Amino acid sequence: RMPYQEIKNVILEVNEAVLTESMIQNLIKQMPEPEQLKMLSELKEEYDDLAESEQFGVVMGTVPRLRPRLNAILFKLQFSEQVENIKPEIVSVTAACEELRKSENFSSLLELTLLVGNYMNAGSRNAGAFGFNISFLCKLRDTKSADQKMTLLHFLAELCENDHPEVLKFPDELAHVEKASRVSAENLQKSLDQMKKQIADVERDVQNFPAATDEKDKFVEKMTSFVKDAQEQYNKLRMMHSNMETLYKELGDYFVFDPKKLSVEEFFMDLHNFRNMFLQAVKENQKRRETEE
Amino acid sequence: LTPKKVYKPEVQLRRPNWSKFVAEDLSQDCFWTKVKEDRFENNELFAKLTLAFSVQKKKVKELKVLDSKTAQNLSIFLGSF
Amino acid sequence: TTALVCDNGSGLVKAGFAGDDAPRAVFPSIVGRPRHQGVMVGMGQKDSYVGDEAQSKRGILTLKYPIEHGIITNWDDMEKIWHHTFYNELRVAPEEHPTLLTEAPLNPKANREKMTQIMFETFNVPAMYVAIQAVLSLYASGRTTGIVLDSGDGVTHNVPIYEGYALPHAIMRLDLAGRDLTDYLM
Amino acid sequence: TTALVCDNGSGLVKAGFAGDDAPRAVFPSIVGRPRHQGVMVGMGQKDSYVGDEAQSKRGILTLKYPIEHGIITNWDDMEKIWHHTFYNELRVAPEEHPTLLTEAPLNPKANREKMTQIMFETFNVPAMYVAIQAVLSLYASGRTTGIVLDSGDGVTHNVPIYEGYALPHAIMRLDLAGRDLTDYLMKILTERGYSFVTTAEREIVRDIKEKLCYVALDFENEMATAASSSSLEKSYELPDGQVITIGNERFRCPETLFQPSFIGMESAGIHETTYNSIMKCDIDIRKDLYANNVMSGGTTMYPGIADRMQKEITALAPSTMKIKIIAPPERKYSVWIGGSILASLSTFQQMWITKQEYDEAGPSIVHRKCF
Ligand SMILES: Nc1ncnc2c1ncn2[C@@H]1O[C@H](COP(=O)(O)OP(=O)(O)O)[C@@H](O)[C@H]1O
Ligand SMILES: Nc1ncnc2c1ncn2[C@@H]1O[C@H](COP(=O)(O)OP(=O)(O)O)[C@@H](O)[C@H]1O
Ligand SMILES: [Mg+2]
Numbered sequence: 001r002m003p004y005q006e007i008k009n010v011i012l013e014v015n016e017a018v019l020t021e022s023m024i025q026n027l028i029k030q031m032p033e034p035e036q037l038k039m040l041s042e043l044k045e046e047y048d049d050l051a052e053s054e055q056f057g058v059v060m061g062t063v064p065r066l067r068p069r070l071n072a073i074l075f076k077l078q079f080s081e082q083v084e085n086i087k088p089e090i091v092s093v094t095a096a097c098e099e100l101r102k103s104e105n106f107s108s109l110l111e112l113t114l115l116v117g118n119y120m121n122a123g124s125r126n127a128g129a130f131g132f133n134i135s136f137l138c139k140l141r142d143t144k145s146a147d148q149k150m151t152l153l154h155f156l157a158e159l160c161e162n163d164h165p166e167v168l169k170f171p172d173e174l175a176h177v178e179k180a181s182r183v184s185a186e187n188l189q190k191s192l193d194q195m196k197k198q199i200a201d202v203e204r205d206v207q208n209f210p211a212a213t214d215e216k217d218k219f220v221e222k223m224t225s226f227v228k229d230a231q232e233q234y235n236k237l238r239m240m241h242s243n244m245e246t247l248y249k250e251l252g253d254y255f256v257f258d259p260k261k262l263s264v265e266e267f268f269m270d271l272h273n274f275r276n277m278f279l280q281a282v283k284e285n286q287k288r289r290e291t292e293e
Numbered sequence: 294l295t296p297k298k299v300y301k302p303e304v305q306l307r308r309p310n311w312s313k314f315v316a317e318d319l320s321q322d323c324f325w326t327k328v329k330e331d332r333f334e335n336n337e338l339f340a341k342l343t344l345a346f347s348v349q350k351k352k353v354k355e356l357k358v359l360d361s362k363t364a365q366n367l368s369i370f371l372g373s374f
Numbered sequence: 375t376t377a378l379v380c381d382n383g384s385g386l387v388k389a390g391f392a393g394d395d396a397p398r399a400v401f402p403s404i405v406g407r408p409r410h411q412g413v414m415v416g417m418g419q420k421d422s423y424v425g426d427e428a429q430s431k432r433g434i435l436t437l438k439y440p441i442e443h444g445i446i447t448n449w450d451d452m453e454k455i456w457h458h459t460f461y462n463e464l465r466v467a468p469e470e471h472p473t474l475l476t477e478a479p480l481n482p483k484a485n486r487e488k489m490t491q492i493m494f495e496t497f498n499v500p501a502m503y504v505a506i507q508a509v510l511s512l513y514a515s516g517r518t519t520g521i522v523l524d525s526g527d528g529v530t531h532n533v534p535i536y537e538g539y540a541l542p543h544a545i546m547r548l549d550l551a552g553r554d555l556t557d558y559l560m
Numbered sequence: 561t562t563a564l565v566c567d568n569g570s571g572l573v574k575a576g577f578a579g580d581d582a583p584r585a586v587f588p589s590i591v592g593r594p595r596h597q598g599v600m601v602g603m604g605q606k607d608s609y610v611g612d613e614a615q616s617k618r619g620i621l622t623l624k625y626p627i628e629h630g631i632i633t634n635w636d637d638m639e640k641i642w643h644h645t646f647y648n649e650l651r652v653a654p655e656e657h658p659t660l661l662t663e664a665p666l667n668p669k670a671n672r673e674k675m676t677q678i679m680f681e682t683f684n685v686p687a688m689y690v691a692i693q694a695v696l697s698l699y700a701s702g703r704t705t706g707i708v709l710d711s712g713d714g715v716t717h718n719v720p721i722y723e724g725y726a727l728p729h730a731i732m733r734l735d736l737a738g739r740d741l742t743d744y745l746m747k748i749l750t751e752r753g754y755s756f757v758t759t760a761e762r763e764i765v766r767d768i769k770e771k772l773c774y775v776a777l778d779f780e781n782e783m784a785t786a787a788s789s790s791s792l793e794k795s796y797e798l799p800d801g802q803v804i805t806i807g808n809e810r811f812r813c814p815e816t817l818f819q820p821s822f823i824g825m826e827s828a829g830i831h832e833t834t835y836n837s838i839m840k841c842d843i844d845i846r847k848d849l850y851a852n853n854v855m856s857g858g859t860t861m862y863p864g865i866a867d868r869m870q871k872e873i874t875a876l877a878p879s880t881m882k883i884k885i886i887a888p889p890e891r892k893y894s895v896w897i898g899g900s901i902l903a904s905l906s907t908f909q910q911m912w913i914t915k916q917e918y919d920e921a922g923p924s925i926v927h928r929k930c931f
């Protein structure tokens with residue numbers, strides 16, 4: 001229910017107090033072809049006789065370069081949502097990588113499981129193993145005993161209840177693991193490459209835009225301030241993703257697992273399920289000790 | 294570096310079948326070069342790992358053929374009839 | 375030992391042993407207390423009469439029903455009903471006897487909480503159970519399925535049971551039974 | 561010549577003039593009849609009170625809904641609803657204004673036949689139209705394509721429309737909405753000892769459901785929170801002066817929409833209904849419908865529904881495509897707002913069902929003219 005000259009004035013000013021994301025989304029999705037816009041622009045003399053959609057096309061046909069201009073406006077209003085989707089994924093992986101890096105009680109658990117597991121895998125293919133995968137730790141519960149009453153998870157929880165009562169505070173140190181259990185690294189790379197391509201398309205739009213023939217036309221000042229702000233925020237996002245890729249390659253060296261054999265979301269789903277299985281195993285061992293009393 | 298301790302237990306034990314990491318893949322600053330798991334070594338732990346991972350009213354009734362639910366609904370029916 | 379079945383209905387308490395054809399002690403659940411002036415000293419004048427003794431002497435007593443519409447309002451009166459049906463009528467020791475109880479459907483839960491608390495603390499049985507009345511009526515009829523219209527003195531409820539499963543969502547409760555008919559006849 | 565938009569839903573009649581932003585007359589669709597013995601002579605004691613007068617004097621009346629499960633059962637009661645919303649609420653003569661009407665999808669056709677016959681014989685307009693409620697809910701969302709979960713008081717239906725084309729084979733219908741939630745709240749309010757059996761008590765329980773109930777995010781975590789501490793309890797003052805307090809039953813009442821096994825319905829939840837309605841469409845058009853979940857009706861006015869809906873659809877759908885839920889705050893009158901948008905258009909002047917078309921084709925041209 002807006003007048004059509006008001007829609008043109010909001011578009012030509014880039015009136016950010018009026019412009020919203022879903023408005024420009026609905027404007028692009030119902031916009032006709034620029035050949036249809038130029039054919040409507042040939043019939044400006046009969047403006048009182050054309051339809052309401054056709055009177056909208058006469059007013060919109062006067063604005064030049066309309067389809068890459070509206071896509072640059074669409075990428076501008078979606079840039080704040082695209083940073084707020086991409087960045088807390090990267091912070092969640094980086095905080096989970098930094099929490100797993102120091103991780104001294106869980107590192108003593110990793111030394112204890114490797115010593116017990118190499119005694120179990122003695123004479124097998126895994127005999128003399130220097131390390132084992134962190135995503136395999138859900139299957140410590142699958143390693144059952146001969147009487148099938150306790151697991152290897154239940155045996156290691158009972159051993160840490162008896163011998164070393166400082167290992168058991170490991171799963172409260174894993175804080176950003178469940179947030180990093182649903183983050184895909186390839187989708188972060190595809191979105192940042194789409195962000196890098198679209199910033200280059202807006203900066204090509206900015207540089208190919210002509211001089212403003214109106215004092216209302218604030219397209220040159222506001223979009224170049226956006227390109228200066230978006231290139232700063234992408235370089236903040238590219239440095240943090242390079243820090244994310246360095247910390248993933250550092251933990252790829254640290255846990256000696258390949259970066260291509262497992263992504264981030266199956267990495268930390270198994271770590272969050274190992275947190276819930278160990279919390280169940282201590283509560284079941286405390287229940288079994290209270291049952292025996 | 295040193296190779297890991299080749300244990301030889303008397304009894305074959307149940308094992309978790311992980312994908313093992315050989316010494317050729319290992320980096321210089323990794324976790325598994327700094328593993329000092331022989332401070333956790335115990336013969337009692339290996340013995341436990343070998344040992345574990347190698348009436349005024351008579352109302353019970355033996356059901357040799359029938360199951361629990363069929364004998365319950367029959368005794369409901371025979372108690373009513 | 376022999377279990378006890380004690381239907382604590384709204385109007386009549388029916389108590390007896392397990393496996394019997396007829397209930398041993400059928401008596402109305404009233405608590406009678408005197409309202410006039412007692413002039414004769416001695417003579418065994420109790421302050422309360424429970425059961426048939428309150429029915430026999432009802433011309434000088436105010437009678438209170440401890441259960442109204444399946445909900446136990448007065449709980450000390452309900453303890454007096456339970457003590458009278460354990461010690462006077464049935465003449466047993468309830469600390470060495472299991473005791474099943476009945477309950478109307480769509481009841482408030484705190485009635486069952488206080489029933490469990492009284493039956494496990496004051497009248498401390500080795501075991502007890504709370505059962506739905508329509509399931510017991512369908513067991514007494516002999517069939518496994520069917521819909522029971524059970525109407526005691528306060529609660530008139532339709533409960534359908536299919537293959538031994540009591541369906542919860544189709545239980546329909548109407549608070550219109552024999553006490554409302556008695557007041558309408560009055 | 562201003563047109564009239566009149567949503568005759570199961571919940572409330574929403575009627576008013578076309579071209580406006582809010583409906584002029586929003587009133588519940590009940591007919592109250594007296595059940596006791598009238599003892600005072602004179603003073604104009606009517607035999608039937610229609611609309612808000614039945615709501616005001618509800619302590620002596622038996623209330624009858626003329627629409628049950630989206631289908632008009634009683635017809636003289638619906639004629640009294642139409643006479644009250646034409647002559648008393650809007651206070652205009654109906655035969656000088658065109659009228660737009662709303663209708664549920666998958667309707668029996670004789671409802672449409674009798675609606676056309678009543679509107680062309682009793683309240684005989686020069687022109688009328690019958691529209692689908694989901695198309696009007698999608699028209700007021702500022703768009704053309706998308707899927708509408710329209711949940712009134714009786715009918716909860718998912719209709720996907722792609723590029724203005726309503727797909728008929730993917731329309732799914734579940735008979736679980738706010739009247740059944742109100743009856744389930746009447747069922748679970750007796751667990752605390754607050755019995756509600758009359759039809760006048762159903763309005764009090766519906767006011768409790770409107771004011772105090774909310775959709776939980778996790779069912780088990782909120783149940784453990786309510787079982788742990790009494791921090792979720794809320795108080796309500798009854799019109800006679802009594803005060804009730806409720807705990808977990810604030811969120812167990814709209815949990816039937818996401819778990820329909822509580823009242824004994826075999827079909828799955830509304831998120832699974834939406835997922836099966838989108839999966840009944842083509843594989844190329846699913847990405848537009850994943851980001852265009854538009855909600856409407858008074859049942860979707862809970863302050864917890866969008867996060868639970870987004871979490872359930874994101875757990876259902878694959879994570880490669882974007883999931884977005886559209887929840888405008890004006891979704892209670894969005895059917896009326898879409899009717900006011902559609903009625904004022906110059907393209908809609910050729911789509912009117914006129915008096916001469918009714919005289920030529922009977923009351924059966926509404927099947928072949930509309931969708
Ligand atoms: N022959 C009869 N005809 C009609 N009503 C009866 C008859 N016998 C008993 N009643 C009614 O049934 C009620 C007793 O029902 P009952 O199931 O014994 O109640 P409760 O078990 O709750 O004490 C009485 O209040 C009485 O009004
Ligand atoms: N804030 C609210 N929270 C929960 N339910 C509500 C709220 N507001 C209204 N409702 C429910 O929505 C219903 C109204 O829906 P409505 O859009 O009138 O459907 P219809 O038009 O099909 O009758 C009412 O019956 C009421 O129970
Ligand atoms: Mg009875």
Ligand SMILES: [Mg+2]
Pocket residue numbers: 567568569570571712713857
């Ligand atoms: Mg409606």
